[PDB]
Amino acid sequence: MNITDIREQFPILHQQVNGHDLVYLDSAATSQKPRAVIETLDKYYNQYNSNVHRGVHTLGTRATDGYEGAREKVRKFINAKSMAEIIFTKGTTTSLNMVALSYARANLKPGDEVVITYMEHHANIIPWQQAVKATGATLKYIPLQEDGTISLEDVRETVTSNTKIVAVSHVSNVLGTVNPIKEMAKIAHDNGAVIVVDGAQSTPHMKIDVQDLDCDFFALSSHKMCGPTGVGVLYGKKALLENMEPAEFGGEMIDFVGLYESTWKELPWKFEAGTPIIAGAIGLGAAIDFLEEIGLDEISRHEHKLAAYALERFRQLDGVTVYGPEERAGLVTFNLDDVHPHDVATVLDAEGIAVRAGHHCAQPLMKWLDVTATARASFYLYNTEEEIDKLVEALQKTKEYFTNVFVDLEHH
Amino acid sequence: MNITDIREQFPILHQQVNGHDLVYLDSAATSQKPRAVIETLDKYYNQYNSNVHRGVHTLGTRATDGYEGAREKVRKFINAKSMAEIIFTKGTTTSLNMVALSYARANLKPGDEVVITYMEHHANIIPWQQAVKATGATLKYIPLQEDGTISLEDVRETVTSNTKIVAVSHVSNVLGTVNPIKEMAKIAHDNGAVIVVDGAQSTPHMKIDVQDLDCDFFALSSHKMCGPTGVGVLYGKKALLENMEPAEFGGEMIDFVGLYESTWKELPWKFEAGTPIIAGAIGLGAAIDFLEEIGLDEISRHEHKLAAYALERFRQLDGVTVYGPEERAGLVTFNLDDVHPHDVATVLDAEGIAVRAGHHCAQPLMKWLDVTATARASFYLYNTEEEIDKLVEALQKTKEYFTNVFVDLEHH
Ligand SMILES: Cc1ncc(COP(=O)(O)O)c(CN)c1O
Numbered sequence A, B: 001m002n003i004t005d006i007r008e009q010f011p012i013l014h015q016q017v018n019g020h021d022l023v024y025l026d027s028a029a030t031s032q033k034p035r036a037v038i039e040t041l042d043k044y045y046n047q048y049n050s051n052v053h054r055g056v057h058t059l060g061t062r063a064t065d066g067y068e069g070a071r072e073k074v075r076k077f078i079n080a081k082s083m084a085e086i087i088f089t090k091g092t093t094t095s096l097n098m099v100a101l102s103y104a105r106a107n108l109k110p111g112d113e114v115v116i117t118y119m120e121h122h123a124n125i126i127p128w129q130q131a132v133k134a135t136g137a138t139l140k141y142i143p144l145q146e147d148g149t150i151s152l153e154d155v156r157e158t159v160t161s162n163t164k165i166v167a168v169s170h171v172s173n174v175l176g177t178v179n180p181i182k183e184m185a186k187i188a189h190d191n192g193a194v195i196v197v198d199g200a201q202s203t204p205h206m207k208i209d210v211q212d213l214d215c216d217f218f219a220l221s222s223h224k225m226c227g228p229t230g231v232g233v234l235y236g237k238k239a240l241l242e243n244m245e246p247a248e249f250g251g252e253m254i255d256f257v258g259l260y261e262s263t264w265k266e267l268p269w270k271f272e273a274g275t276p277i278i279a280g281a282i283g284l285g286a287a288i289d290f291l292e293e294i295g296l297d298e299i300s301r302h303e304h305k306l307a308a309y310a311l312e313r314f315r316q317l318d319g320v321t322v323y324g325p326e327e328r329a330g331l332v333t334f335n336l337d338d339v340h341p342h343d344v345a346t347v348l349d350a351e352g353i354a355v356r357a358g359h360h361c362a363q364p365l366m367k368w369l370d371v372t373a374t375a376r377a378s379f380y381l382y383n384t385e386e387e388i389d390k391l392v393e394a395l396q397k398t399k400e401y402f403t404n405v406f407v408d409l410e411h412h
């Protein structure tokens, strides 16, 4: 895995911000795209754009073939059994909302429980809040360990015989924690619950095997894995998807339409209403081809190296707090003592470095951490150890700057 | 308006299918894109892709500026009062589903009525079926005239004091009918109902003024108006959107998130959950710039010329039936006597001509027309009268071919 050869394919990396070479460390917010993906979109719009689900003309046939072949690429990518289990959506948020609407709100009675965690992204919190409110069920939270991980015994304690759904993140976009998804799946199944995996942060950076995880549902976003914006995937076990009603209604998802009643298509098109995200889905397939040619295990090893290096170099900094465990994905969420993270991000961008500051759409996690906001640098396959050196040097410069600005008007 | 200069900007038009120059007459299924839109997507992914809703780094600021500027472009394009009334969605289908979920299902009691028409696309039928089923309300249909138009007195007869929603198409993708949207809006308001305009087929081809139409909701799709796939718009009057609950929940649309309760953002972000369709929305803004530079009135005049020419030349054909009125948008839906429309589309594609065959996602309209399927050729700003000549010549050739294949084995 040659990182220079990889960076060469991402045109956006080769520019300056504020007179400094761009150092993009915000891939958890969104990832950048290689030329393969952009040129896939270009070839689609230049050569064979047409509405899909063929039968009539040539460009329509080519568009349909591209779209459904991207579906098959996704099926192979996460090791789903059937294309009927692969639903193209707007993103992770929409997929989780679909599960909450068509599964949760249809399978929850008073006394039932939906169990989530304190580290969940808002996308994996608010749909369940609304579903339990609509059904009169109960929302429960699995507590976290001191290092930001989840113990299996806390899972067994929180999940009960009344738990119908356990919704959990595969990888936390804040803590870097990789949750024991497989063991949690078996624990949930032992109590008669299904499991809903938020895999927005796992899918871009590590191999996904839905058959080995035995997840009942799995959600992912294209924009985080070198793919186009506005497209994502809902995977669900075919037996569960067959008994769920559609979340959206309209053309393409119908079979027979009467004046007052209608019948739906078979999976997966039952859950894809209207003209689909054709170009975006084909580009997501191109992104999958790109990542597979590089190898997800290679990318994960590279990110392990980056994360270990970054954790050590952060521990070389005085007055910096890092949140989460030692064993982690490729990201570091932190805070400088007596410097607000927003100012940290501002100064870093002045140095050309792109990080994120705020709650990272995980307010309950922020309150569990006893902070209002944090700063975060996230890595991907195009990032290098030199960029982490620049990051820690800029953090030291920031510490010194806000220190001596403080001492100067103390004297004044 | 120079049609050669316009065609020069669409690379996909300059290719051959089955050894014949491409003749794309399927723009009602989807439209093709100029270089301005494709290169807008390219510049986004090459230069300033980042997650939006800024505050931290430079590329994020540029991405946010592009996204919200596209929102402002849309507001100007349809003459909405405020950007708070412009919601980016997945497409027309999703926008109509949002209105049916968050307005209809919250404002319908038994005895209430939702009134639609027989010419409606499935996107403007099935959500209302499901909403009236969920609320115990009643679905009603406005009858059609013999020429496929809607009389205002039939509207006054169907809409009653119990009608809460009137959902109607601005332009029929099958009949070519332009419905009297403004008069229907006032009729609906006189009875205490809101009006929901399906403008997927109107927006690409004619000027939209939501303040002059006085539509309560208006839906549109980017892929039909030279814009990227997977993005559309829901417009709704700000006063109605303020009292509607969100259709989706997650990050970006929240303000405060507690363990069990949450508060929403102000409009329009209340209705945009998760990472939005950044590139697609910016490209839709580019498509709006393109169409405005050409001029929607110019495009509408060109399509009027094309439609009149096509209707005359179709009337020069023996044994061909055309459906709809004389005054129409730029499309012709038809049938050849004793030739199934699917065979018509097949032969036409063999001649390089791209038309559509089937129900066009309007099965109740097909049954009203007393046919099972039809063929359809739809026009846009890059189509010419020479292409219509090729179409009618291929239809005559098809008539003669299926005639003499029939006579040859009659003799055999
Ligand atoms: C008149 C009409 N209504 C609504 C739709 C559905 O729009 P979409 O598939 O983009 O969601 C279509 C499909 N072209 C249409 O032409």
Ligand SMILES: Cc1ncc(COP(=O)(O)O)c(CN)c1O
Binding pocket: A028, A029, A091, A092, A093, A094, A121, A123, A124, A169, A171, A172, A173, A198, A200, A201, A221, A223, A224, B251, B273, B274, B275, B276
């Ligand atoms: C872990 C996690 N969960 C879910 C989401 C939401 O995904 P999206 O905004 O693409 O819908 C995010 C946002 N990056 C995330 O990182």
